[PDB]
């Protein structure tokens, strides 16, 4: 039921929270958004770079733009869901802005747990425990606990960041269970690894240390079981599809916009790649009167995102029943009529942005930086008596699995600067 | 009308007797020795640390000068062989050989950038701006109209001529290049005034400072260059070989600026074949081109071919208008008559839009104005009050007739490496 998928429950609650009795000015889904804005992990995205270190393409702005596109998807789908299921409003008190707030909040947080240097940074963490120093702990861990480490996922670390208990602060940000369900693109544990080619099975979404929490979330939401073994898996909260579409749309279109502004993509290619996405709404005469490259391409970007938002709303509603029953197999953007153009855009970005010498140089440097910090923390964990390892603990961080996963969580959330600075000190270089 | 027997003079400054070509040792031929004198000279060596517009560390003025001198040697060899067919007595009676023309063009071309200030034509303009509106405006009423014009329109070509010929104690005549080489060096045989008397390319700039006028008068008289004016404002018709030095330079900066910009990313690689297909298609091996897997290899194949095409045509243009050049009645450059002027123009235009107006280049030239002004001001203030403790410090640091002093300060600031210039500038400024 959509009634259960829209849970306002917060972790530790002993009583049901009913939608009809909420204060409109203090609606739990919108409180969630505010809690994220003011959280220290979201603020740290100011000093985190998406791919190009130009200092004006942060992960903060990306997260903001994804949440704006999310609220728009949530509002429009919300309005149509309330027309399809009128009891949801007339009896339970839901409003279309509710679905915008849930999608907006989970999208705002989607990037929050990811390590620096993108996918290279996840792979360096994993390689540290698969083949580097962290190999030694394998025999002291369960198969799923070790799999958390060798296949470290920033999505799962995001879930940990949002919900981690600390003294005086149990339950992290304590977001609504609907918001956490809309956050979880991959509602499975680290094993079994990729049991199918379903998008929800391409990674996993929570570490073992958050397993008990997501169990409580999935039971409250009423997510459909995808496993009846001790390897737990569930079908995605419907709104998670909208969070994913917001991110899909922004990375595809805005990465391209960035590449052109940066010079990595010749501006001559702008209209060729965008014409199908914008061709019926573009005011060509206004496009030609624009005098700056950055204005022409942001005009194209707004047209394309508009096109892809309207279509994604319509794809969600064409497949809503399948999504509610956990039988939908793809992403919304996979069903797009512009799939081929989207793929050409993404491939051009891989060729001209992600495989440029500057980006490659950053990732190679990232591997050493993270590998160094992980070894410094893990040796300090093994022999915490020596003077050097007392110092290492005071500089970076003032059960074995709980310890190792916390070290990954902490190295992962370090800003680009502090990582490079602490790495520089450990290696002596300035 | 000029005579090829006098235009090929082996005279060096101060010579008391004539140098006949027949009497030369071919192992120590005057024109070839000119090339070595340049290679080994301090001003040429300093081009190692003098960057062009782009500072990739592998785009130097030494490489440009080298490649211009190579293309120049080819131009002069091929024209030289055709000139000896037309005028056989030059070999039968005077003993000239076609490699002589190759050597003259090659030595003049090699030296053509030797006197330019750093930072391009922006460097020249920073110096002029200094004397036109900066601290150096104060000298206007103590200089002649033409001494002041030398300064406010300071010209790297004219500074070049000074570098090659400047007398010093124990070194009369500078490098003492052959007069034929000095004649081919001089793309603009005129004084600083009058400014742009005509639209001829030879009238666009000027070629020698007042301090060097008497010197070029000697060169022009010996070569027998044709007097283009006798109004007390001296100018001559260009030595014919000067058109080839110019053509070699024109060819290289047109094609190799394009290549460089493609390699640096500033010009999409697609434009390479698009602007160059007319210039290469009669000579390109398509099979070879489509096998080359690296962009740098493809565009340098195209560049080698485009340059070959333009050398061959430039030789033809010279030989066609040879009699008009000898009469001083040829009004254009060799490249202005090329049948690829449409293609050359589009190349030059794209290079300007994507390279010369790129943000990196604009930035380097703006900082150059500040670096050159600061050095010129420290030098001129030290000249004006040599008595203060500071100006005596400045004198020990930067340099251990009023017009001669000012032009020498200009020559010295202009010939500084980018390293010494920036380091000395930073020192003056406390950085
Ligand atoms: Mn994202
Ligand atoms: Mn040149």
XYZ file of C-alpha atoms in Angstrom, chain B:
431
model
C 68.154 48.836 -61.534
C 69.993 46.653 -58.998
C 72.730 44.171 -59.935
C 73.033 40.613 -58.599
C 76.842 40.917 -58.566
C 76.655 43.676 -55.933
C 73.628 42.202 -54.119
C 75.711 39.107 -53.207
C 78.378 41.076 -51.363
C 80.779 39.245 -49.067
C 81.846 42.538 -47.436
C 82.054 42.674 -43.655
C 82.050 45.905 -41.621
C 85.407 47.670 -41.680
C 86.763 45.734 -44.676
C 89.571 47.618 -46.391
C 89.692 45.492 -49.561
C 87.159 43.736 -51.783
C 86.135 40.094 -51.242
C 85.723 38.335 -54.583
C 83.519 35.224 -54.550
C 85.958 33.300 -56.789
C 88.801 33.817 -54.315
C 86.915 32.360 -51.334
C 87.724 29.055 -49.690
C 84.616 26.888 -50.113
C 85.314 25.262 -46.719
C 85.078 28.766 -45.120
C 82.526 30.507 -47.356
C 81.494 33.914 -46.001
C 77.765 33.187 -46.178
C 78.059 29.790 -44.416
C 80.287 31.276 -41.664
C 77.468 33.763 -41.035
C 75.210 30.878 -40.002
C 77.783 29.536 -37.498
C 78.433 32.980 -36.064
C 74.726 33.237 -35.249
C 74.320 29.713 -33.780
C 77.226 30.334 -31.411
C 76.323 33.900 -30.388
C 74.969 34.829 -26.967
C 71.751 36.416 -28.354
C 70.893 33.276 -30.310
C 71.625 30.907 -27.418
C 69.346 33.039 -25.206
C 66.352 31.997 -27.375
C 66.415 28.734 -25.351
C 64.651 30.548 -22.486
C 62.363 32.802 -24.559
C 58.865 31.453 -25.098
C 56.408 32.184 -27.892
C 52.747 33.080 -27.132
C 52.128 29.589 -25.691
C 54.377 28.441 -22.820
C 54.191 24.607 -23.093
C 58.013 24.491 -22.588
C 58.307 22.841 -26.038
C 57.150 25.825 -28.135
C 60.292 27.987 -28.218
C 61.487 30.891 -30.364
C 64.686 28.837 -30.938
C 62.606 26.103 -32.607
C 60.751 28.730 -34.707
C 63.989 30.345 -35.733
C 65.487 26.956 -36.551
C 62.520 25.837 -38.633
C 62.327 29.196 -40.422
C 66.029 28.932 -41.304
C 65.539 25.380 -42.663
C 62.599 26.430 -44.883
C 64.636 29.514 -45.811
C 67.605 27.405 -46.907
C 65.288 25.428 -49.212
C 63.751 28.590 -50.713
C 67.155 30.120 -51.412
C 68.615 26.923 -52.863
C 65.816 26.564 -55.400
C 65.705 30.238 -56.350
C 69.514 30.286 -56.353
C 69.631 27.472 -58.916
C 67.058 29.178 -61.169
C 68.835 32.569 -60.880
C 72.111 30.983 -62.039
C 70.255 29.630 -65.099
C 68.805 33.058 -65.939
C 72.064 34.966 -65.355
C 74.783 32.420 -66.214
C 77.642 34.939 -65.914
C 77.128 34.942 -62.126
C 78.629 31.426 -61.996
C 80.799 31.576 -65.190
C 82.538 34.871 -64.303
C 81.891 35.607 -60.620
C 82.034 32.057 -59.239
C 78.668 32.030 -57.460
C 76.954 28.704 -56.680
C 73.350 27.920 -55.824
C 74.140 27.025 -52.185
C 75.316 30.622 -51.700
C 71.717 31.847 -52.015
C 70.645 29.038 -49.700
C 73.156 30.193 -47.103
C 72.228 33.911 -47.228
C 68.499 33.274 -46.749
C 69.224 30.639 -44.083
C 71.396 32.957 -41.980
C 69.041 35.939 -42.244
C 66.043 33.749 -41.411
C 67.875 32.139 -38.472
C 68.430 35.632 -36.997
C 65.061 37.174 -37.849
C 63.654 36.861 -34.285
C 66.919 37.528 -32.426
C 66.073 41.073 -31.312
C 62.397 40.754 -30.432
C 61.297 41.537 -26.849
C 59.553 38.826 -24.846
C 55.740 38.532 -24.955
C 55.256 38.905 -28.696
C 54.116 42.093 -30.361
C 52.674 42.911 -26.941
C 56.282 43.191 -25.768
C 57.088 45.744 -28.450
C 53.943 47.678 -27.603
C 54.689 47.645 -23.850
C 58.006 49.371 -24.607
C 56.407 51.919 -26.938
C 53.640 52.583 -24.416
C 56.334 53.290 -21.812
C 57.842 56.124 -23.897
C 54.522 57.352 -25.310
C 52.520 57.572 -22.063
C 54.598 56.155 -19.189
C 57.610 57.510 -17.344
C 59.526 57.685 -20.638
C 57.262 60.417 -22.054
C 59.498 62.851 -20.159
C 62.231 62.508 -22.811
C 60.098 63.653 -25.759
C 61.424 67.219 -25.844
C 65.068 66.087 -25.614
C 64.899 63.757 -28.628
C 64.457 64.273 -32.325
C 61.170 63.308 -33.941
C 62.846 60.150 -35.342
C 64.705 59.250 -32.153
C 61.396 59.426 -30.284
C 59.601 57.445 -33.003
C 62.209 54.669 -32.553
C 61.045 54.473 -28.943
C 57.247 54.922 -29.077
C 57.054 52.488 -32.026
C 59.940 50.287 -30.799
C 60.492 47.541 -33.392
C 61.997 44.094 -32.775
C 63.255 43.946 -36.378
C 65.308 47.120 -35.832
C 66.550 45.817 -32.477
C 67.598 42.665 -34.332
C 69.772 44.652 -36.754
C 71.400 46.358 -33.744
C 72.118 42.995 -32.046
C 73.782 41.660 -35.196
C 75.932 44.730 -35.941
C 76.512 46.562 -32.639
C 80.133 47.550 -32.092
C 81.607 47.086 -28.611
C 85.179 47.518 -27.310
C 87.115 44.643 -28.879
C 84.243 43.583 -31.126
C 83.801 46.043 -33.979
C 80.858 45.142 -36.186
C 79.000 42.715 -33.906
C 78.725 39.293 -35.480
C 80.133 40.921 -38.650
C 77.750 39.158 -40.991
C 78.207 39.486 -44.755
C 76.410 42.491 -46.204
C 74.308 40.214 -48.449
C 73.062 38.522 -45.267
C 72.391 41.908 -43.655
C 70.618 42.970 -46.864
C 68.385 39.877 -46.796
C 67.722 40.406 -43.069
C 66.239 43.874 -43.739
C 62.525 43.365 -44.479
C 61.867 47.116 -43.972
C 64.750 49.225 -45.333
C 63.496 52.528 -43.886
C 63.801 54.855 -40.900
C 61.114 55.136 -38.221
C 59.732 58.242 -39.939
C 57.751 58.796 -42.001
C 55.292 56.337 -40.474
C 53.568 54.059 -43.032
C 54.236 56.312 -46.070
C 52.573 53.724 -48.370
C 50.666 50.444 -48.202
C 53.648 48.363 -49.371
C 54.608 45.621 -46.918
C 58.118 47.122 -46.936
C 56.640 50.428 -45.587
C 54.572 48.840 -42.779
C 57.274 48.921 -40.095
C 60.838 50.201 -40.073
C 64.068 48.266 -40.091
C 66.738 50.283 -38.283
C 67.071 52.706 -35.395
C 68.708 56.095 -35.722
C 71.682 54.619 -33.880
C 72.155 52.150 -36.779
C 71.275 54.392 -39.735
C 74.876 55.119 -40.752
C 75.529 51.372 -40.605
C 72.699 50.404 -42.918
C 73.664 53.254 -45.281
C 77.017 51.451 -45.729
C 75.230 48.122 -46.345
C 72.744 49.678 -48.778
C 75.445 51.498 -50.761
C 77.579 48.329 -51.122
C 74.646 46.108 -52.145
C 73.547 48.917 -54.448
C 69.991 48.905 -53.120
C 67.746 51.310 -55.018
C 67.022 54.625 -53.278
C 63.224 54.758 -52.744
C 63.348 58.277 -51.231
C 65.895 61.168 -51.152
C 63.724 63.558 -49.069
C 66.239 63.364 -46.137
C 64.020 60.506 -44.948
C 66.060 57.603 -46.295
C 64.559 54.350 -47.507
C 65.584 51.771 -50.094
C 63.977 49.054 -52.165
C 64.231 45.618 -50.502
C 67.172 43.341 -51.241
C 65.496 40.629 -53.415
C 66.500 37.811 -51.033
C 64.553 39.586 -48.250
C 61.324 38.393 -49.915
C 62.429 34.799 -49.362
C 63.292 35.349 -45.694
C 59.812 36.830 -45.253
C 58.196 33.978 -47.194
C 59.900 31.321 -45.007
C 58.702 33.096 -41.863
C 55.152 33.570 -43.249
C 54.963 29.894 -44.239
C 56.131 28.611 -40.870
C 54.003 30.723 -38.572
C 50.923 30.104 -40.758
C 51.224 26.301 -40.867
C 53.033 25.584 -37.594
C 50.856 27.895 -35.471
C 47.915 25.844 -36.771
C 49.618 22.507 -35.999
C 50.613 23.673 -32.502
C 47.079 24.792 -31.685
C 45.603 21.491 -32.834
C 48.096 19.650 -30.628
C 47.395 21.898 -27.599
C 43.637 21.280 -27.896
C 42.719 24.889 -28.747
C 41.668 23.958 -32.307
C 39.477 20.871 -32.861
C 41.416 18.302 -34.948
C 38.607 18.174 -37.534
C 39.614 21.586 -38.961
C 43.072 20.234 -39.850
C 42.113 18.393 -43.035
C 39.300 20.902 -43.684
C 41.523 23.982 -44.037
C 44.510 22.112 -45.485
C 43.118 19.669 -48.076
C 43.668 22.030 -51.019
C 47.309 22.530 -49.945
C 48.116 18.802 -49.613
C 45.873 16.793 -51.940
C 48.179 16.748 -54.962
C 50.988 15.238 -52.851
C 49.378 13.353 -49.935
C 49.469 9.533 -49.687
C 45.968 8.710 -48.415
C 47.022 5.205 -47.396
C 49.772 6.607 -45.179
C 47.457 9.226 -43.642
C 44.732 6.774 -42.648
C 47.252 4.398 -41.056
C 48.670 7.057 -38.705
C 46.967 6.454 -35.335
C 47.996 9.597 -33.416
C 46.626 13.107 -33.984
C 50.093 14.660 -33.654
C 51.389 12.331 -36.369
C 48.506 13.115 -38.744
C 48.726 16.898 -38.404
C 52.525 16.936 -38.749
C 52.249 14.883 -41.944
C 49.788 17.491 -43.225
C 52.144 20.288 -42.091
C 55.197 18.813 -43.855
C 53.112 18.616 -47.048
C 51.498 22.061 -46.772
C 54.948 23.579 -46.210
C 56.358 21.725 -49.222
C 53.500 23.003 -51.391
C 54.033 26.590 -50.255
C 57.834 26.561 -50.756
C 57.407 25.370 -54.370
C 54.852 28.060 -55.105
C 56.896 30.812 -53.423
C 59.853 29.927 -55.655
C 57.604 30.296 -58.705
C 56.252 33.676 -57.523
C 59.786 34.991 -56.970
C 60.993 33.907 -60.424
C 57.882 35.360 -62.071
C 58.254 38.797 -60.478
C 62.058 38.583 -60.334
C 62.588 41.588 -62.621
C 60.036 43.691 -60.739
C 61.720 42.893 -57.399
C 65.102 43.853 -58.876
C 63.505 47.162 -59.937
C 61.892 47.766 -56.544
C 58.448 47.847 -58.191
C 57.015 44.727 -56.474
C 54.397 45.895 -53.976
C 53.328 42.674 -52.226
C 54.794 39.793 -50.324
C 55.359 36.502 -52.116
C 52.609 34.908 -50.037
C 50.128 37.668 -50.968
C 50.143 36.232 -54.501
C 49.610 32.588 -53.465
C 46.679 30.751 -55.065
C 45.876 29.402 -51.575
C 45.345 32.858 -50.043
C 41.761 31.835 -49.242
C 43.042 28.787 -47.346
C 45.972 30.648 -45.761
C 43.571 33.364 -44.582
C 41.108 30.965 -42.935
C 44.062 29.276 -41.200
C 45.424 32.567 -39.886
C 41.927 33.587 -38.777
C 41.226 30.401 -36.823
C 44.677 30.588 -35.226
C 43.915 34.153 -34.078
C 40.508 33.255 -32.665
C 41.538 30.079 -30.836
C 45.196 30.744 -29.940
C 46.190 34.406 -29.997
C 42.922 35.442 -28.312
C 42.907 32.444 -25.952
C 42.740 33.376 -22.265
C 46.208 31.979 -21.512
C 47.861 34.102 -24.200
C 45.978 37.293 -23.317
C 47.063 36.819 -19.679
C 50.775 36.357 -20.489
C 50.781 39.538 -22.596
C 49.010 41.632 -19.971
C 51.541 40.573 -17.343
C 54.289 41.311 -19.863
C 53.265 44.973 -20.041
C 53.784 45.230 -16.275
C 57.080 43.316 -16.263
C 58.566 45.393 -19.109
C 57.373 48.757 -17.754
C 58.797 48.012 -14.313
C 62.199 47.090 -15.750
C 62.235 50.112 -18.058
C 61.355 52.458 -15.190
C 64.050 51.086 -12.890
C 66.558 51.563 -15.715
C 65.476 55.056 -16.715
C 65.252 56.368 -13.118
C 68.744 54.988 -12.526
C 69.921 56.793 -15.657
C 68.312 60.057 -14.475
C 69.649 60.061 -10.862
C 72.658 57.680 -10.877
C 73.748 59.169 -7.535
C 71.255 57.668 -5.070
C 72.047 54.513 -3.116
C 69.074 52.702 -4.660
C 69.916 53.604 -8.260
C 73.506 52.488 -7.727
C 72.117 49.167 -6.456
C 69.889 49.003 -9.558
C 72.949 49.703 -11.716
C 75.012 46.861 -10.222
C 72.011 44.550 -10.667
C 70.748 45.315 -14.190
C 73.716 46.930 -16.033
C 77.255 46.557 -14.643
C 74.328 60.383 -25.315
C 70.772 60.478 -24.014
C 69.248 58.803 -27.085
C 72.024 56.184 -27.198
C 71.458 55.419 -23.503
C 67.683 55.023 -23.982
C 67.916 52.829 -27.070
C 70.517 50.686 -25.313
C 68.237 50.265 -22.288
C 65.554 49.143 -24.730
C 67.925 46.736 -26.476
C 68.998 45.194 -23.175
C 65.548 44.820 -21.662
C 64.430 43.338 -25.000
C 67.145 40.670 -25.092
C 66.713 39.412 -21.514
C 65.616 35.808 -21.179
C 62.179 35.302 -19.639
C 64.053 33.864 -16.641
C 66.351 36.822 -15.921
C 63.538 39.284 -16.684
C 60.999 37.761 -14.271
C 63.612 37.100 -11.548
C 64.921 40.670 -11.809
C 61.375 42.004 -11.890
C 60.405 39.961 -8.822
C 63.547 41.190 -7.027
C 62.721 44.842 -7.792
C 59.192 44.195 -6.454
C 60.163 42.227 -3.322
C 58.524 38.986 -4.485
